[PDB]
Write an enzyme that holds these catalytic residues in place. Structure first.
Site, PDB file in Angstrom:
ATOM      1  N   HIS A 142      45.636  80.126  73.526  1.00  0.00           N
ATOM      2  CA  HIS A 142      44.702  81.184  73.936  1.00  0.00           C
ATOM      3  C   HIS A 142      43.681  80.623  74.924  1.00  0.00           C
ATOM      4  CE1 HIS A 142      42.045  84.802  72.841  1.00  0.00           C
ATOM      5  NE2 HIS A 142      41.190  83.988  73.430  1.00  0.00           N
ATOM      6  N   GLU A 143      43.110  79.464  74.604  1.00  0.00           N
ATOM      7  CA  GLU A 143      42.094  78.878  75.476  1.00  0.00           C
ATOM      8  C   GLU A 143      42.678  78.470  76.820  1.00  0.00           C
ATOM      9  OE1 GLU A 143      39.409  79.658  74.341  1.00  0.00           O
ATOM     10  OE2 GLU A 143      39.763  79.660  72.166  1.00  0.00           O
ATOM     11  N   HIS A 146      43.150  81.332  79.145  1.00  0.00           N
ATOM     12  CA  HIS A 146      41.986  81.781  79.908  1.00  0.00           C
ATOM     13  C   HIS A 146      41.915  81.096  81.274  1.00  0.00           C
ATOM     14  CE1 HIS A 146      40.018  84.602  77.286  1.00  0.00           C
ATOM     15  NE2 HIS A 146      39.863  83.761  76.277  1.00  0.00           N
ATOM     16  N   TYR A 157      35.258  89.281  82.704  1.00  0.00           N
ATOM     17  CA  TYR A 157      35.156  89.196  81.235  1.00  0.00           C
ATOM     18  C   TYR A 157      34.206  90.230  80.627  1.00  0.00           C
ATOM     19  CZ  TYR A 157      35.990  86.668  76.828  1.00  0.00           C
ATOM     20  OH  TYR A 157      36.321  86.268  75.556  1.00  0.00           O
ATOM     21  N   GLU A 166      41.391  89.081  77.284  1.00  0.00           N
ATOM     22  CA  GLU A 166      41.567  88.651  75.902  1.00  0.00           C
ATOM     23  C   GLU A 166      42.989  88.847  75.410  1.00  0.00           C
ATOM     24  OE1 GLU A 166      40.116  87.135  73.243  1.00  0.00           O
ATOM     25  OE2 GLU A 166      39.023  86.316  74.982  1.00  0.00           O
ATOM     26  N   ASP A 226      29.761  92.180  72.339  1.00  0.00           N
ATOM     27  CA  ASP A 226      30.994  91.450  72.626  1.00  0.00           C
ATOM     28  C   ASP A 226      31.472  91.724  74.053  1.00  0.00           C
ATOM     29  OD1 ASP A 226      33.367  89.845  72.146  1.00  0.00           O
ATOM     30  OD2 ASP A 226      34.410  91.654  71.414  1.00  0.00           O
ATOM     31  N   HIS A 231      36.989  91.390  72.550  1.00  0.00           N
ATOM     32  CA  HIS A 231      37.807  90.947  71.423  1.00  0.00           C
ATOM     33  C   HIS A 231      38.162  92.076  70.462  1.00  0.00           C
ATOM     34  CE1 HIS A 231      35.675  87.218  72.685  1.00  0.00           C
ATOM     35  NE2 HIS A 231      36.827  86.639  72.397  1.00  0.00           N
TER      36      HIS A 231
HETATM   37 ZN    ZN Z   1      39.516  84.489  74.426  1.00  0.00          ZN
END
Ligand code: ZN
Ligand code: 79F
Ligand code: CA
Ligand code: CA
Ligand code: CA
Ligand code: CA
Length: 316
Positions: A142-143, A146, A157, A166, A226, A231
């Site tokens: 996931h990271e 990005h 974002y 996301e 958020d 998310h």
């Molecule tokens: Zn993320």
């Protein structure tokens, strides 16, 4: 650092033994020279200065408790590199073999992980909400995803573009988890979340509503928390991706599944050819339809299934 490539051994966050690519020059460093221009793992030493110190070890054995987050950040970055290269013909996050850098032991009790614009960063968790987050291969992927997004579509974002950002990270995090093929699922973060509670996770792609996230556009969040729900509203896209791959009938709309490999091809092409920094959910649908058309033809089952999945989640 300049040195010679070596192979160490250690144990990850979940107690499993694995080999790691290291570099020897006086010390053994968490520097894998076998992939692109290297994978480098750093110790942030419970502080917030980044990157910290390139991880140095006297004997090339990484079995201490303090070592475990570093072992997994380093190893799972390698798996993620391999997925992008072998499956998508992409060389690192920038497509030109950029060095991949991660820091572990970030801060104290830190219940998160992130890409800071230049590197991956992993907290250790507080021991109750999380154990060290690099123990989750889906989290690591996931990271790194990005970084891929930032170099390609560049999805801003916040709001819908941020929820797409996301979901792309959850989708490819999951596809990397399936690529490695150890206990794969359509849940996010289950290996590191809430050690005292079995069977839960941060998010579910198969049923986002299990963890409070919307599974239909009519349930989207439009408040300001958020970053506008990045998310939260990711659940709508995660559900569409799950349906494309696995099929199902959702709010009465039936989707014929086409499998994970085709899901990944369609979304990788959308991300790298069609999405832009400001794409919204409707524009993602159009990008996915066009990507499936390019790969499989306008009359294909794959195109039909993309349309049904977005219909099922209320995105026109
Ligand atoms: Zn993320
Ligand atoms: C409970 C927490 C982990 C859930 C959530 N986190 C996740 O779901 C994932 C975990 O992999 N982390 P992430 O999405 O990468 C953050 C932001 C940012 C940071 C640096 C520069 C620019 C922008 C969250 O941040 O709310
Ligand atoms: Ca050692
Ligand atoms: Ca799993
Ligand atoms: Ca998972
Ligand atoms: Ca748990």
């Amino acid at each position: 650092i300049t040195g010679t490539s070596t192979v160490g051994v250690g144990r990850g966050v979940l107690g499993d033994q694995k080999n790691i690519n290291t570099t020897y020059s006086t010390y053994y460093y968490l520097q894998d020279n076998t992939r692109g221009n290297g994978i480098f793992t750093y110790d942030a030493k419970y502080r917030t200065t980044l990157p910290g110190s390139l991880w140095a070890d006297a004997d090339n054995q990484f079995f201490a408790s303090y070592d475990a987050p570093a072992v997994d950040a380093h190893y799972y970055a390698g798996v993620t590199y391999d997925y992008y290269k072998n499956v998508h013909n992409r060389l690192s996050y920038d497509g030109n073999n950029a060095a991949i850098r991660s820091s572990v032991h970030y801060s104290q009790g830190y219940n998160n992980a992130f890409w800071n614009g230049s590197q991956m960063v992993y907290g250790d968790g507080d021991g109750q909400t999380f154990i060290p987050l690099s123990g989750g291969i889906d989290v690591v992927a996931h990271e790194l995803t990005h970084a891929v997004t930032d170099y390609t579509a560049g999805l801003i974002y916040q709001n819908e573009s941020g929820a797409i950002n996301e979901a792309i990270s959850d989708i490819f995090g999951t596809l990397v988890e399936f690529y490695a093929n150890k206990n794969p699922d359509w849940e996010i973060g289950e290996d590191v979340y809430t050690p005292g509670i079995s069977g839960d996770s941060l998010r579910s792609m198969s049923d986002p509503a299990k963890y409070g996230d919307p599974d239909h556009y009519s349930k989207r969040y439009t408040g300001t928390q958020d970053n506008g729900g990045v998310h939260i509203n990711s659940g709508i896209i995660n559900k569409a991706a799950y349906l494309i791959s696995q099929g199902g009938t959702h709010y009465g709309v039936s989707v014929v599944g086409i499998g994970r490999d085709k899901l990944g091809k369609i979304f990788y092409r959308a991300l790298t050819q069609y999405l832009t920094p400001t794409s919204n959910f409707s524009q993602l649908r159009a990008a996915a339809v066009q990507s499936a058309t390019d790969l499989y033809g306008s009359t294909s089952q794959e195109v039909a299934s993309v349309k049904q999945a977005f219909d099922a989640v209320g995105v026109k």
